[PDB]
């Protein structure tokens, strides 16, 4: 195990600790591509957590060091192991650094969190925080990147974020956050705090299912265009997607509770993989 291998293994650990789903799916990639993914993930994770600001500027500065001096040795201010891995990746693939900066800008913003007036700002947030992740991963998951590849990855990520939001309504409220748009909360006649006190009702379902139908529709457009990705990645991406979709059912299964996080059992993930793995 070379030093660089240790670095990637740190990145691996960060990823299976914090997101079982993507980990389960992406680890199935060929050695070289999964390592790149581990590394992009860990950099993203670390951006997400820089909250609990000084450390976020340090991450941004490290990323810029790499962008403009890929082959020079840096003394990273943030996480050496993560940045060493990221720099190794960038030496071999065309990383969209602007997407990292988009992601970071979006995270700065969260500490001024103001509810979204309209779905459009909700969608722009889904871009900044997840669509950007899709863009960064594109060169890993396809041989010849075209605007179409980026577009599909962008849409997949935004759709996954949306599911994430659909799943964490409860937890998110507690942390003083709501991602449903004022526009759409007025329209559907819905007060989060109220439902978080008195359980669900027909108006909440409707609002929730309204957003769910959106995620689900982006999902299919993505599956329809799965072909933009490399052959080895298509089944993995689809598996990753199908798992996050299945979380939609889980939430209905638990009658949309806002007091517990639902999840897809590892065993069910393998079932989906088989379903998918069968015809590939
Ligand atoms: C794998 C592909 C194509 C996309 C994955 C994209 C997915 C689902 C990202 C999860 N996105 C969380 C980003 N972090 C956000 C940031 C604002 C706020 C506070 C922090 C910082 C934690 C959360 C909520």
Describe the structure.
It is a single chain. The protein is mainly alpha-helical. It has one domain (1-280): Farnesyl Diphosphate Synthase, CATH 1.10.600.10. 72% of the residues lie in helices and 0% in strands. It is built from 14 helices and no strands. The protein has helices at 3-18, 20-26, 31-49, 54-68, 80-90, 97-110, 119-141, 147-167, 169-174, 182-188, 192-198, 202-224, 234-253, 266-278. Helix 4 packs antiparallel against helix 6, helix 7 crosses helix 8 and helix 12 runs antiparallel to helix 13 (234-253). Bound molecules: the ligand CC(C)=CCC/C(C)=C/CNCCN[C@H]1[C@@H]2C[C@H]3C[C@@H](C2)C[C@@H]1C3. Residues 22, 48, 107, 110, 129-130, 133-134, 137, 153, 156-157, 160-161, 164 line the site of the ligand CC(C)=CCC/C(C)=C/CNCCN[C@H]1[C@@H]2C[C@H]3C[C@@H](C2)C[C@@H]1C3. It is classed as transferase/transferase inhibitor. Keywords: prenyl transferase, TRANSFERASE-TRANSFERASE INHIBITOR complex. The assembly is monomeric. Co-crystal structure of dehydrosqualene synthase (Crtm) from S. aureus with SQ-109. The protein is Dehydrosqualene synthase. The organism is Staphylococcus aureus.
């Amino acid at each position: 195990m070379t030093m660089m291998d240790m670095n990637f293994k740190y990145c691996h650990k960060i990823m299976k600790k914090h997101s079982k789903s993507f980990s389960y799916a992406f680890d199935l990639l060929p050695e070289d591509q999964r390592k790149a993914v581990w590394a992009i993930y860990a950099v993203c994770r670390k951006i997400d957590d820089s909250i609990d600001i000084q450390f976020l500027n340090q991450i941004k500065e490290d990323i810029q060091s790499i962008e403009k001096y890929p082959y020079e040795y840096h003394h990273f201010q943030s996480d050496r192991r993560i940045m060493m891995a990221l720099q190794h990746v960038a030496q071999h693939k065309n990383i969209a650094f602007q997407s990292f900066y988009n992601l970071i800008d979006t995270v700065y913003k969260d500490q001024h969190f103001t509810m979204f007036e309209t779905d459009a700002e909700l969608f722009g947030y889904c871009y900044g925080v997840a669509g950007t992740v899709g863009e960064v991963l594109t060169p890993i998951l396809s041989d010849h990147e075209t605007h179409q590849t980026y577009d599909v990855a962008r849409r997949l990520g935004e759709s996954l974020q949306l599911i994430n939001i659909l799943r964490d309504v409860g937890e998110d409220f507690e942390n003083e956050r709501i991602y449903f748009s004022k526009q759409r909360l007025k329209q559907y006649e819905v007060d989060i705090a109220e439902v978080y006190q008195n359980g669900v009702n027909n108006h909440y379902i409707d609002l929730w299912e309204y957003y769910a139908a959106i995620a689900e529709k982006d999902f299919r457009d993505v599956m329809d265009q799965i072909k933009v990705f490399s052959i080895e990645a298509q089944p993995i991406i689809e598996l990753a997607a199908r798992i996050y979709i299945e979380i939609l059912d889980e939430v209905r299964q638990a009658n949309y509770t806002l007091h517990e996080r639902v999840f897809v059992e590892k065993r069910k993930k393998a079932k989906l993989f088989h379903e998918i793995n069968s015809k590939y």
